[PDB]
From a paper:
We also obtained high‐resolution crystal structures of CNF‐labeled proteins in both the oxidized and reduced states, demonstrating that site‐specific placement of CNF caused minimal structural perturbation, and giving a precise location for the CNF side chain in each protein.
Spinach FdI was selected as the first model system because of its small size and the accessible redox change in its [2Fe‐2S] cluster. The reduction potential of wild‐type (WT)‐FdI determined by cyclic voltammetry, −0.40 V versus the standard hydrogen electrode (SHE) (all potentials are subsequently quoted vs SHE), and the UV–visible spectra for air‐oxidized and dithionite‐reduced FdI were consistent with previous reports. Crystal structures of WT FdI and variant Y37CNF were solved at near‐atomic resolution for both oxidized and reduced states of the protein. Superposition of the structures confirms that the cluster environment is well‐preserved in the CNF‐modified protein, and is unaltered by redox state. Differential scanning fluorimetry data reveal similar melting temperatures for WT and Y37CNF variant FdI, suggesting the structural similarities are maintained in solution.
Residue numbers in the entry: -3 to 95, 101
């Protein structure tokens, strides 16, 4: 497997869709911000609802998140501040209200 890689992230946001390359060692949130995208957050530590999204295709590593339970992870919930892509992914953002 490659020492380093980047994956195509498609974010489906309330103001439109955007795509960018995310390094496999950068969280979705941080990579979005580098591209000038404003995404919701507060704690940036994987322990709250602020940065919630829904995974629509592809795979994430969310080992660094703790607030979502195993059923919520199975349902496709994502804490964008604590998730790394391991494939190209599509995430629908700004989902805190739906999650909670
Ligand atoms: S901003 Fe709190 S879990 Fe992501």
């Amino acid at each position: 497997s490659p020492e380093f890689a980047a994956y195509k992230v498609t974010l489906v946001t309330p103001t439109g869709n955007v795509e960018f390359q995310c390094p496999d060692d950068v969280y979705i949130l941080d990579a979005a911000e580098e591209e000038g995208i404003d995404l919701p957050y507060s704690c940036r530590a994987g322990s709250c609802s602020s940065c919630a999204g829904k995974l629509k295709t592809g795979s994430l590593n969310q080992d660094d998140q703790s607030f979502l339970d195993d059923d919520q992870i199975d349902e496709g919930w994502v804490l964008t501040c604590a998730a790394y892509p391991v494939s190209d992914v599509t995430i629908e953002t700004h989902k805190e209200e739906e999650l909670t």
